[PDB]
């Protein structure tokens, strides 16, 4: 099952994947911008079976830097990531979602990272929850400094696929 | 004019089966001049690696189902040829850790000590190409693998502690893919040392180095690691 992880720069896309699969992510520390990469992870579904997921890490999206359109043409599922401290990161989750619908069933999980910076928040939980209900996707407010936040969204994605 | 046009279109087509795309991607590699392929690789790096990786993973599971056959080895040898062409034509992106993890794990599946000798030598050959492009931008681990490519040498020392090639490859609910031998063997330093030197000499003589010719920079980086870990214990 091919999964595309996409979001704005430094929202935590690679930290989520690496802290999920290895738990060795130290916050801050090594900072290298991602370009393209694939992680292999097996996820226990809710039944208890295991599905092998090809997690394609993406280069951070930016003003003038859009997602390649061929990801839409092969991705089985999407992990959309914003940072709750960055409103624009959430705004890009929305526009990516509208793309996903246009460019052709798929599984989408929206993650809200860096909630440990609650006092530094720029994405209200209520507005994010309401958008999740409106687009009929599942949205978790998670953080990389606490791995337990990450498990729930990914087991749900695996159960779909 | 149909062969290249028709084959190229299918390789670029995302809807087409990745297996079908590989068939025609290999066709391009055999009939297209190197300078032409380099520009093709530079333009379509993202999807070409997608074709390689999905097909490689595809073959891995096949080898673990049908077992090792003649036909499987044909396919495997083809995938690595594409793999090599990726390592040759995209050093600048590889240098920037483009598919750092997927390439790393893929090489670890060849370098696993349970593999047949042929595959293990193939892993060494491709690893050195990866490191020559990765150069200084490599992480610590790649150095330790380089210092452990040859069994029997004094156990390497890392930041966490002592390590071996087998420790570097294979240290409740969700777990990452565990590396397993691609072609398990079926029922020594003289040897793998010769392999390491034999391949490093070939890389020195290797032609068609990128116009930036940062291959020279990487090879000397490769040499310093060789000077640090293997040369001291050589007569
Ligand atoms: N405090 C805190 N920092 C976090 C959290 N998640 C990620 N970070 C930090 O945010 C930075 C960016 O993380 P990284 O995974 O490299 O982001 P990316 O989105 O993969 N980068 P790009 O989009 O440029 O490829 C790192 O310094 C990381 O430690 C989190 O939950 N809390
Ligand atoms: Mg990244």
Numbering used by the authors:
A (entry chain C): 5 to 108, 112 to 168
B (entry chain A): 7 to 177, 184 to 199, 207 to 254
Tell me, in the authors' exact words, what the paper reports.
κB-Ras1 and κB-Ras2 are small GTPases with noncanonical features that act as tumor suppressors downstream of Ras. Via interaction with the RalGAP (GTPase-activating protein) complex, they limit activity of Ral GTPases and restrict anchorage-independent proliferation. Other noncanonical GTPases of the Ras family are κB-Ras1 and κB-Ras2, which were originally identified as regulators of NF-κB signaling. In contrast to most GTPases, they lack a membrane targeting motif and a catalytic glutamine. κB-Ras GTPases not only show intrinsic GTP hydrolysis but also have fast nucleotide exchange rates, which shifts them into a constantly active form at physiological G-nucleotide concentrations.
We identified a fragment of RGα2 (RGα2N, residues 2–255) that forms a stable complex with κB-Ras1 (1–175) when coexpressed in bacterial cells. This RalGAP subcomplex was crystallizable, and we determined its structure at 2.72 Å resolution. κB-Ras1 adopts a canonical G domain fold comprised of a six-stranded central β-sheet and five α-helices. The N-terminal domain of RGα2 is composed of 10 helices forming tandem repeats that are twisted and have large loop insertions with short β-strand and α-helical elements. The nucleotide-binding pocket of κB-Ras1 is occupied by a magnesium ion and the nonhydrolyzable GTP analog 5′-guanylyl imidodiphosphate (GNP). Second, κB-Ras1 contains a leucine at position 65 instead of the catalytic glutamine 61, which is found at the equivalent position in Ras GTPases. Leu65 is tightly bound in a hydrophobic pocket formed by Cys10 of the β1-strand, Leu71 of switch II, and Leu100 of the α2-helix. The Gly64 carbonyl is oriented in a way that together with the backbone carbonyl of switch I Thr38, a water molecule could be coordinated in a position suitable for nucleophilic attack on the γ-phosphate of GTP. We observe no interactions of the κB-Ras1 switch region residues with RGα2N, consistent with previous findings that κB-Ras binding to RGα is nucleotide independent. The binding interface is constituted of helices α4 and α6 of RGα2N 10-helix bundle and the strands β1 and β2 of κB-Ras1 at the back side facing away from the nucleotide-binding pocket. Finally, a large loop inserted between α8 and α9 of RGα2 (V157–F211) folds back into a binding groove between α1 and β2 of κB-Ras1.
